[PDB]
């Protein structure tokens, strides 16, 4: 019926607004840490960086058993979901934080970081490719419920490796990509290429993603020590 796909519609939405924080809402702010020229990492901006990423990884779990049904699944599979699309959330949210006159990301509590510094934080050789992304993701105009539903898609993903129950995470994430479609439609008639945009987009990201994974390798040796707990369970995956 209409009524709970409006219904579903409004949760993840609230879900998503409620655990990510928009960036015009957020009070933007600097440093002035490595902002001079790139360099194989610097050790403060990693600091605030990683710890900045722990706190966006609970945030998603938060999102993620916000969405109708994530919850039924088995515990095995909620955390099967998590590990697999994790780092894609990440992406997609840094990334819809991008503001392009400035060049730079906000991240959730505020800290604005400029191309050299993302680098400098972690990204290192996977920067530009971050931006180029994040540039690609303008034309789109997607909004906070887009972003929001488009990031419960990434996740709710039956064909990950150790899902137990793989049918009932397909049935799950149905609704999610008729909530999509109706509201890009609805919010935008005269762009009916829109949902399979941001569609294709789940694709890139996941390419981006298994790079930044990549990425994870050589910075542990860059590391004067091992990554926090969350991020390694992300990247255990
Ligand atoms: C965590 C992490 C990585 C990527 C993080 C990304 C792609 C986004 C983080 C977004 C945050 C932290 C947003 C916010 O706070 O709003 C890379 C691949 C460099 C490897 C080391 C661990």
């Known amino acids: 019926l209409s009524p709970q796909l409006e ?12 655990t990510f924080p928009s960036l015009c809402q957020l009070g933007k702010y600097t440093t002035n840490s490595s902002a001079d020229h790139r360099v194989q990492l610097d050790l403060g901006l990693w600091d605030k960086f990683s710890e900045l990423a722990t706190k966006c990884i609970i945030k998603i779990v938060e999102f993620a058993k ?9 515990i095995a599979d909620q955390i099967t979901l998590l590990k697999a699309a994790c780092l ?29 510094q993302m680098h400098n934080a972690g990204f290192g050789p996977l920067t530009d490719l971050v931006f180029a992304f994040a540039g690609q993701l303008l034309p789109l105009e997607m909004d906070d419920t887009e972003t929001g539903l488009l990031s419960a898609i990434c996740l709710i993903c039956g064909d990950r490796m150790d899902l ?10 149905e609704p ?18 829109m949902f399979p945009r941001m569609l294709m987009k789940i694709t890139d990201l996941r390419g981006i993603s298994t790079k930044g994974a990549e990425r994870a390798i050589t910075l542990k040796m860059e590391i004067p020590g091992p990554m926090p707990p969350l991020i390694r369970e992300m990247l255990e995956n």
């Open 66 to 74: 916000r969405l109708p049904g994530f919850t039924g699944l088995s």
């Open 7 to 18: 219904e579903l519609i409004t949760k993840v939405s609230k879900a998503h607004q409620e």
């Open 176 to 193: 999610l990509l008729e909530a999509l479609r109706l509201y890009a439609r609805r919010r935008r008639p005269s762009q009916p290429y």
């Open 164 to 173: 137990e129950e793989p049918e009932k995470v397909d049935k799950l994430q």
């Open 88 to 116: 894609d959330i990440l992406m997609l949210r840094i990334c819809t934080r991008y503001t392009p006159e400035q060049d730079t990301m906000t991240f959730s509590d505020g800290l604005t970081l400029n191309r050299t």
